[PDB]
Amino acid sequence: VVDTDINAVTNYIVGMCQKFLQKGEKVTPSSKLEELRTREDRLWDCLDTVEFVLDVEEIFDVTVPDEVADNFQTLQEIADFVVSERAKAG
Fold first, then answer.
1. Beta bridge partners of 1
2. Host domain of residue 74
3. What is the C-alpha separation between 82 and 5, in angstroms, rounded?
4. H or E element in which residue 71 lies
5. How many domains does the chain have?
6. DSSP 8-state class, residue 70
7. Which one, of 50, 40, 46, lies nearest residue 20 by Cα?
8. Contact in structure between 82 and 56 (CB atoms under 8 Å)
9. Deepest of 9, 20, 42, 78, by most Cβ within 10 A of its Cβ?
10. What three-state secondary structure class fits 74?
11. Alpha helix positions (H), 1-90
């Protein structure tokens, strides 16, 4: 996608997140990740965030510092971070 377009990046990241989830589970950009049920029929936890951040780093070519990753609670925040990093001059 256009990696500085928040709509496109957010839609993409929602799609990525859905692959982690139990069938029929609903996720929106404002959903608290920790309230979501994963394929393992358990609630999303710190491991899922670590894995998801790595997936995002791979696809969008951004570096997420641990301090940032440790404070993510929603997909909108992740999409916002991706766009902000890609949009930065230099």
1. none
2. 1-90
3. 10
4. none
5. 1
6. T
7. 40
8. yes
9. 78
10. coil
11. 6-18, 46-60, 66-69, 75-87
